[PDB]
Amino acid sequence: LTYFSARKGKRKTVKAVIDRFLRLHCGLWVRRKAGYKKKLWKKTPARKKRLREFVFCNKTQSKLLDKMTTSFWKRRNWYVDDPYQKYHDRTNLKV
């Protein structure tokens, strides 16, 4: 997806997935479940909480957007007042 630009000849990230997803440095990507802001009146309480909770992504669609993004978005970022600091790293992972 736009492998080489015209003014510099570099990959170009689309700001779509920036607004939709978020990266952890281990290589994981999360997202807000769709349909969480529409027709909440008819949904049971168990459904709307399932929509409010975050969800990870499969390796394929994660790999797909990883091909899209550039190395700038993959670097380690040390934010302040960031709850994702505990999750950028991984612990007790075997195979």
Binding site: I18, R20, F21, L22, L64, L65, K67, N77, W78, Y79
Partner: protein, 287 residues
């Protein structure tokens, strides 16, 4: 050695006796012949070989995965979010044991980055470095560490051993010169004066608990007493030791180095240091 005594008997090395490590440069495989030549690994018939496949992330008219997911405030203003690089007092204990940074003198981000303790990328919007509680044990530094951010355990551990902690904010172009001043000294311009913190970090750098350089010195004994009262350790009054003056060496705002000040132009080839000596220029650099 067993390596060299072979070469003396073996013949002389030249271009003809030259060869790389086997397994490094694998041979190129071009599509010419019976094996690859027929279709060259592009499929039988379709966009795969014709080259008119859709873009990446296309589902054949179906809504791609990246549009069906709603937008949320994950990374907005990330080019202005607050960032700082970690620094562990384990490493500080490690680096002083190696002797690259001397505890006899006041430690600083300049002495740190001159020691290559941690890299820093000011154009990647990191306004300094924070202390990290990991390393509370095995710490006898006694240094007058200069930092930007600081944790409560790091301050207590440093003050227990007799050291000194203090926060000091730097601007983007005021920090890149701090972490790397010599190329600006190849320019010849006067070093710029620092600024006050932004319109949200002032409560932090004015508070006494976090050792704010705007906070009063009268409140630091109170904060020291509460930390000793908190984590249960004696409070060593550092006025006794001979180097108490060194430990209290601190830079006022709008000054980078303890020696140098804004407006002071420095030169290395035919080494000289110069002043403006104009009332209009001098009184602003103090401001």
């Amino acid at each position: 050695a067993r390596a060299l005594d072979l070469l003396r008997g073996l013949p002389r090395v030249s271009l003809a006796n030259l060869k790389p490590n086997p397994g490094s440069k694998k041979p190129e495989r071009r599509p010419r012949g019976r094996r690859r030549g027929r279709k060259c690994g592009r499929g039988h018939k379709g966009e795969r070989q014709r080259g008119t496949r859709p873009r990446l992330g296309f589902e054949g008219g179906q809504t791609p995965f990246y549009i069906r997911i709603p937008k949320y405030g994950f990374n907005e203003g990330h080019s202005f979010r607050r960032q700082y690089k970690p620094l562990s007092l384990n490493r500080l204990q490690y680096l002083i044991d190696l002797g690259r940074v001397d505890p006899s003198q006041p430690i600083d981000l300049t002495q740190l980055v001159n020691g290559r303790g941690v890299t820093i990328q000011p154009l990647k919007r990191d306004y300094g470095v924070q202390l990290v509680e990991e390393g509370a044990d095995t710490f006898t530094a006694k240094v007058n560490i200069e930092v930007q951010l600081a944790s409560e355990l790091a301050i207590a551990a440093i003050e227990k051993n007799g050291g000194v902690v203090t926060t000091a904010f730097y601007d983007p172009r005021s920090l890149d010169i701090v972490c790397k001043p010599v190329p600006f000294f190849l320019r010849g311009q006067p070093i710029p004066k620092r600024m006050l913190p932004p319109e949200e970090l002032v409560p932090y750098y004015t508070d006494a608990k976090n050792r704010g350089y705007l906070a009063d010195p009268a409140k630091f004994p109170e904060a020291r007493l509460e930390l000793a009262r908190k984590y249960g350790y004696i409070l060593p009054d550092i006025t006794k030791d001979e180097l108490f003056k060194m430990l209290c060496t601190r830079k006022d705002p709008r000054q980078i180095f303890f020696g140098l000040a804004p407006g002071w132009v420095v030169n290395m080839a035919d080494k000289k240091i110069l002043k403006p000596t104009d009332e209009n220029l001098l009184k602003y650099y103090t401001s």
